[PDB]
Symmetry: C5
Subunit: 99 residues, 5 copies
C-alpha cells in the first residue's frame, strides 16, 4: 500500500452504474521519507471515511475490490486505513495530532 | 484511478473478436491541474460516452473488466466516469461547465 | 492498453508446458506522440498474428489471459490488436497505409 | 518479488474492518547491494513477523492475498519471507 | 513478460509455509541490446530450473500463479522460459549457443 494525503473529492454524475454512490477522493502521494510529491490519484472511499488532509493508506489493483460492495466495481484504488502515526526506529516520521 | 483527457482515437480492423464494437480512445493522463503527462492508455469506452478534451477517470488492470460486458474481454483500461467537479479543501479546481 | 511496434520474435525450447505453441514477440513500446521508446516487452501473440514492424495494442496483466487459449497460461502481456491508424484531435500520427 | 528493509511501523485506529489486527510495516526497497531506494510499500505482516532493519521479501498485487487469512483483505503488499542469504553463487551478497 | 538474467539465489529459512519448497532466484533485468540494468528482482522457478547466466522470461502479477502448484502461493514473479534466441528482422541478437 502507498501513503497519501486526502486533498479533495471528485464528483461525477455521468459514470458507470456500478460506481453509483461511491465516494471518490483526490489524494496526493507521499514518499518513503514522508514528503508530499506532485503525484496524485483518485481512490474510492466507501468504507473508511477519511477527512480533509488526513494521511491514509491506498491499496491498488484487485485489492481495492476486496472492500465490501466493491467486488464487481471498476475501482483499482481504495482508501483502506487512516494513519495516526508512522514510527521510524522510535522517532516519529508522522503523527496526526501534530499534522 | 487516474484523471485523463481524450486525446485521440485508434482504429483497428484486425483484432481480437471481443473488441468488435468497442471504441478505442487514446487517453492521456493529466496532473492535478489538467496538464497532459507523458503517460497514456488506449482504453475502452463503451458505457460512459467521453468526448473530446473532457476530464475522465480511468481504471486500469482487472478493474477494467468489471464494467458491464467487459467481464471476458482482454481490456486493461477503461473510462469509468466523466468528471463534473473537483474540489481541493472545498475550493473548486475543475468544473466541466467551464 | 499500450501501443507498441513488433520488433522481432523470442524463441524458447525450454519453457513451462503451458507456453508450448505460444508465439512470443519482442515489442518496442511507443509513447503518446508516436515515438519509439528504449523499452522492450515480450508478449504472447497466439491470437492476432502480428507481423514484423506492425504497430499493435498490448494488454497487460490478467487481461492478457482473456484471449482464446490463454486462460491458464502465465502470460502477462498479449497482442490484442493490429493498429491501422492513430489520430490526435484530427491529425494522423500513424497510418498503416502510409 | 522485491527485497526490502523494515524501516517503520504504521499505526491506524480507523480502517476497513478486514484490516483489524493486521500489522502494517513500512518497507523500503533496496537494490542488489542493499542500498535503500526511493520506493516503498506499506505491507501487511501477520504471517512472518519481521523486525526492524531486517531484510524481507515482499510480494505485491493479488499475490499478497494468498497468505492464509489475507484472502479477502484489501492488501496489495505483504512480507512473505525473511532473507537469510543471497548467493550470487560462490560470491555472497548477503547473510543476515 | 520481461527478459532477465539469473544473477543468484535467494535463501530464506523464516517464511510463509506457502513458500516452502519454492526455489527463489535473483534476476537482473535486461533491456533491448542485452545490457544488464542495475534493476533486480526475485522470482520463483520450480518449473524451469534456469541456471546461472541464463537469459530467462519472467511473468509478473497473477500470471505467475498459473504455473503448476503456484496457484495459492504469494508469487508475483516467476520464470516461465529459458530464451533460446531473439530473432530481429534479419539480424539475431542473442543465442544460448554462443554465450
Amino acid at each position: 500500500m502507498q501513503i497519501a494525503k486526502v486533498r479533495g473529492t471528485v464528483v461525477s454524475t455521468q459514470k458507470d452504474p456500478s460506481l453509483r454512490g461511491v465516494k471518490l477522493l483526490l489524494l496526493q502521494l507521499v514518499d518513503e521519507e514522508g514528503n508530499l510529491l506532485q503525484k496524485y490519484e483518485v481512490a474510492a472511499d466507501n468504507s473508511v471515511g477519511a477527512g480533509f488532509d488526513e494521511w491514509v493508506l491506498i491499496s491498488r489493483g484487485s485489492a481495492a475490490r476486496q472492500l465490501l460492495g466493491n467486488e464487481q466495481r471498476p475501482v483499482d484504488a481504495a482508501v483502506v486505513a487512516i494513519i495516526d502515526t508512522i514510527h521510524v526506529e522510535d522517532r516519529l516520521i508522522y503523527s496526526k495530532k501534530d499534522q
